[PDB]
């Protein structure tokens, strides 16, 4: 029973991971072949850059604007920055924008989403000059709608690129996210790889490695079949016509009669998928963005993402059939995720109830083997020895994702104490249950027998696992003091943050 479950879990995980790796490699080869035929100084497609932010750090906003200006693309019609401001606090972002891009900043007193006339001519009259719009705080979706409307004013614009207010772009980042658009007529959205630049904490390193693995494996596998489930938030590209067509359903999203505020960068991708269009992700475009470093905010963000995913998978499954033979892989991936979550919960419950020492030892050993295999693959792909830290991602996964999943499932339907209860009470209950199961397992098996090989095997395995974990933690601590784990880009950001 337990051995069968462990075996099927291992085979399932390894098979899916190898299949995704092969698909990502094939997609990378296809994109490389497409790029190899790209003529030099290719600027056929006119692209407009749209940046949306809210209360962003002035240094991060300035660096993002400088990186946008550092782009080598010579076919940028204009830069559109939309800030949901209309307040004295938000004036700092406008002041920072002026020091980097022109002077003309407009602050209309109405929102295009809630206005009778949604055309951009009401608030803008010139398309040659870069424009910044300050509007009352409504949401990220409302800010993006204004940018989409402003970009659609110029007929010469053929595609748009969405960049977050705290995203650092490379010189060729814009070219790499717009070249695949012209490769195939059915391609309408392009996603770019996002890499975390700040890795000064143990959580930041794990988040960065998880992001890198996701982008280089799962998004590549999706792009091979042109069924990308979610485009890159900080870095992404869209076609003007599809955006103009699907802006109204995106801005008028209703789940059970109530407006949906969060879940950005997912409903738009789902709407693109419903039209049968193809989405291709490229790894050659690199965007740098920050990641949360606190457990509480990371858990909140993961709970929000889980809620968005739960809302979106229904429509994703309902629209996957429109791709014909395509979309079968996407449905299989969704079923994989659901069955994997359910299977993980079932094995956790079985381990807690049975508390058979042979079961936990085998589960720990197979999990360690999977982590070593994944870390070796990441190191081989990234050509960096720091990828071995992904073995520690299991702890943060267990302590964050499952409580976030439970919170998302329970709070989907139906003073400060009640508000605080909906965030971390479920996580605290999960932690207490895990601790209770652990202490019950330890107490129930309070015996020693060196004459039994099975008990000896379990003790040796658990001792080796603890020794390996301690060695990894010691190595990370040594690297942190030496500051070798810091990303190459982080050193400069620190340098001109100090020199400021």
């Amino acid at each position: 029973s337990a051995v069968w479950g462990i075996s099927v879990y291992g085979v399932f995980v390894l098979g899916f991971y190898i299949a995704q790796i092969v698909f990502s490699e094939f997609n990378r080869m296809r994109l490389s072949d497409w790029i190899s035929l790209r003529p030099d100084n290719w600027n056929a497609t006119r692209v407009a850059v749209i940046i949306a932010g809210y209360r962003e750090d002035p240094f991060m906003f300035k660096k993002c604007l400088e990186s946008v200006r550092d782009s080598e693309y010579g076919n940028v019609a204009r830069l559109i920055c939309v800030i949901d401001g209309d307040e004295e606090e938000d004036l700092k972002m406008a002041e920072i924008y002026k020091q980097v891009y022109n002077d003309n900043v407009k602050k209309p007193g109405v929102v295009l989403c809630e206005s009778e006339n949604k055309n951009g001519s009401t608030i803008d009259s010139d398309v040659s000059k870069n424009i910044c719009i300050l509007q009352p705080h409504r949401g990220k979706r409302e800010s993006l709608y204004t940018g989409f409307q402003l970009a659609s004013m110029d007929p010469s614009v053929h595609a748009v690129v969405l960049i977050d207010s705290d995203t650092v772009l490379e010189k060729n980042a814009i070219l790499e996210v717009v070249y695949p658009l012209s490769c195939d007529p059915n391609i309408k959205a392009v996603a770019g790889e996002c890499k975390i630049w700040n890795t000064d904490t143990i959580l930041s390193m794990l988040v960065s490695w998880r992001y890198f693995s996701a982008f280089n494996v799962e998004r590549g596998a999706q792009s091979l079949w042109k069924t990308v489930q979610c485009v890159g938030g900080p870095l992404g590209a869209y076609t003007i016509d599809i955006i103009n067509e699907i802006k109204d359903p995106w801005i008028t999203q209703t789940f059970l009669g109530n407006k949906c505020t969060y879940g950005d960068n997912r409903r738009l991708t789902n709407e693109v998928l419903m039209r049968g269009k193809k989405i291709v992700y490229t790894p050659f475009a690199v965007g740098w963005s920050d990641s949360p470093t606190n457990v509480m905010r990371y858990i909140v963000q993961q709970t929000r993402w889980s809620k968005s995913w739960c809302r979106e998978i229904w429509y994703t499954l309902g629209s996957a059939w429109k791709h014909g033979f395509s979309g079968i892989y996407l449905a299989f991936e969704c079923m994989y995720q659901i069955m994997y979550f359910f299977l993980v919960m079932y094995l956790f419950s079985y381990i807690a109830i049975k508390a058979d020492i042979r079961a936990q030892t085998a589960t720990v050993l197979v999990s360690t083997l999977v982590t070593i295999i994944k870390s070796s693959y990441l190191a081989l792909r990234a050509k960096n020895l720091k990828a071995f830290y992904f073995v520690l991602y299991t702890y943060v996964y267990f302590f964050c994702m499952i409580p976030a999943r439970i919170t998302a499932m329970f709070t989907m339907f139906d003073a400060r104490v009640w508000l605080w209860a909906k965030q971390f009470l479920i996580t605290y209950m999960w932690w207490a249950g895990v601790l209770a199961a652990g202490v019950y397992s330890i107490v129930d098996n309070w015996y020693f027998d060196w004459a039994d090989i099975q008990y000896r095997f379990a003790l040796v395995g658990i001792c080796s696992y603890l020794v390996f974990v301690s060695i990894v933690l010691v190595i990370y601590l040594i690297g942190k003091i030496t500051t070798w784990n810091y990303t190459p880009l982080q050193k400069e950001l620190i340098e001109e943050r100090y020199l400021h």
Partner: nanobody
Amino acid sequence: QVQLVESGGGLVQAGGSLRLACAASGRIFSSDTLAWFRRAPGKEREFVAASRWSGGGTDYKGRFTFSRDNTRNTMCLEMNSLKPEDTAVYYCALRTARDSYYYTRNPTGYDYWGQGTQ
């Protein structure tokens, strides 16, 4: 913000060639437009050549070619097969893309200007 300093000059016969180098003191951002402008006695300045820092280029010509170093913040525009009417005072100018990304040959659009030689 950006200071442009040019080098090269002197008197040259109708048969010969020479090279002019303009040095930029600041940040180019790989998007600003740099052009060479010359003034003749009795007439307004006319466009000669320009090219973006990232790439591209334009002339008017073929006789004159544009080159950039891109690591020392230096730019050069050498002249081949000179003519007596081609003699003029050359200026180094830079165009910023903060106001707009459109390309124009109007000298009024350029904000940063340098000194003249020869």
